[PDB]
Amino acid sequence: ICVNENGGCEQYCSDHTGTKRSCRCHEGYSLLADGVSCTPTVEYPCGKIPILEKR
Amino acid sequence: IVGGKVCPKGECPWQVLLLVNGAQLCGGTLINTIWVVSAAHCFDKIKNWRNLIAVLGEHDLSEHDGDEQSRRVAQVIIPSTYVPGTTNHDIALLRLHQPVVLTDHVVPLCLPERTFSERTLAFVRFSLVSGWGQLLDRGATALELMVLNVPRLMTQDCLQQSRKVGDSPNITEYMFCAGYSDGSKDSCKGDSGGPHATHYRGTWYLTGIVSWGQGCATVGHFGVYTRVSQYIEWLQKLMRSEPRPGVLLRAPFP
Ligand SMILES: COc1cc([C@@H]2Nc3ccc(C(=N)N)cc3[C@H]3c4ccccc4C[C@H]32)c(-c2ccc(C(=O)O)cc2)cc1O
Ligand SMILES: [Ca+2]
């Protein structure tokens, strides 16, 4: 599943036996209940640009 | 950087400036509060390792505005497979003596997982490269941080689109080409070590390191970048290791 469009994951994707797929996030992020989205848990998460985010 | 623009202050917050004895040496990329990724070749000629400094939050080299944070480089870790003076395995992992403080102007770029980088990031066409390198081939270096959007090529395609020069280094699986062959846009030697950064669904990731090329923005040629995805496991293991005496460390690769 992960090979096709990143398994639908916003960040990281893990394949499991059968049609099972688990999305994960970089440190400083947590996965939302949709099972695909990652949201920051810290003030300065990696890969985000504060002056643009704050606009 | 040739043919790009000024990176608006704060929009390249992971960019690192490396100095030796106060003089600019290379770029680098912050990937968390204590680790920086740069190019191995940046360190071929260093003799006094105690005068190596990383600056975060830098933008304009002519002024001090208070957002700059300087740290001594405590360790430079290079793959055992890198041979000084050559092109392959052009990557270094730098441990700062003290963490930088994350701020609006100092933020790490995400080091991606290998599978995500190979399967997804590698197919994002355009990515940003940045640095205070030469604005023109054989020209002066930039006072303000510059950034350029470049398209990535498959290596087969690179070799087919490139002019043949002979003696030219092979493009290995640990490299990739990006840029333009019309002589207009490229990174340059002074940008060495700096980020090739790729955006995916709202977030930026480290995919390349400015490594080498034929001159700068040379007709018939593309910039060549270290393929960071080959080194994710190597980097992660090292970042979990305890510091060792002596600045330079050669670490086994794989
Ligand atoms: C891959 O290893 C290496 C790569 C480079 C250096 N790095 C880079 C980096 C990027 C590009 C690019 N077009 N995207 C080109 C070069 C290459 C380039 C452009 C113009 C002149 C000479 C060179 C050699 C080379 C150097 C190097 C860097 C700076 C200077 C200088 O300041 O005079 C001289 C040589 C040393 C290495 O060992
Ligand atoms: Ca400054």
So where are chain B's domains?
1-12+109-229, 13-108+230-243
Q: Is B199 among the residues known to form the active site?
A: no
The reply to whether domains B1-12+109-229 and B13-108+230-243 share a CATH topology is yes
Amino acid letter, B101: V
Residue in B19, B192, B224 to alter for ligand 1 test, most ligand atoms within 8 A of Cβ? B192
C-beta of residue B179 within 8 angstroms of C-beta of residue B225: no
Using the 8-state DSSP alphabet, how is residue B97 labeled?
S
Experimental method of this PDB entry: X-ray
CA distance B149 to B105: 21
End-to-end CA distance of chain B: 32
Q: Distance between CA atoms of B191 and B68, rounded to whole angstroms?
A: 19
Separation of alpha carbons B44 and B56, rounded Å = 23
Bridge partner residues of B24 (DSSP): B19
Determine whether B90 is an active site residue. yes
- Cα separations (Å) of B81 from B40, B114, B235? 11, 19, 14
User: Amino acid identity of B227?
Assistant: R
H-helix segments, B98-161 = 114-119, 155-161
Nearest CA in chain A to B116: A12
Q: A45: domain CATH number?
A: 2.10.25.10
Whole-angstrom distance, CA of residue B99 vs CA of residue B77:
17
* Closest ligand (CA of B180): 1
Structural domain count, chain A: 1
Among B26, B168, B189, B216, which is best to mutate for testing ligand 1, by the most ligand atoms less than 8 A from CB?
A: B189
Domain that holds residue A26: 1-55
Report residue B61 as tokens: 């080299």
Q: How far apart are CA B80 and CA B234, in angstroms?
A: 11
**Beta-strand (E) ranges in B86-144?**
92-96, 126-131
The CA distance from B7 to B195, in Å, is 13
Say how far apart CA B214 and CA B87 lie, in whole Å.
Answer: 12
CATH class of B13-108+230-243: mainly beta
Contacts of A47 in chain B (CB under 8 A): 108-110, 203-205
CA B109 to chain centre: 12
CB atoms within 10 A of CB B126: 11
Measured CA to CA, the distance from residue B169 to residue B217 in angstroms comes to: 17
Q: Which CATH number fits domain B1-12+109-229: 2.40.10.10, 3.40.50.620, 3.90.550.10, 3.20.20.70?
A: 2.40.10.10
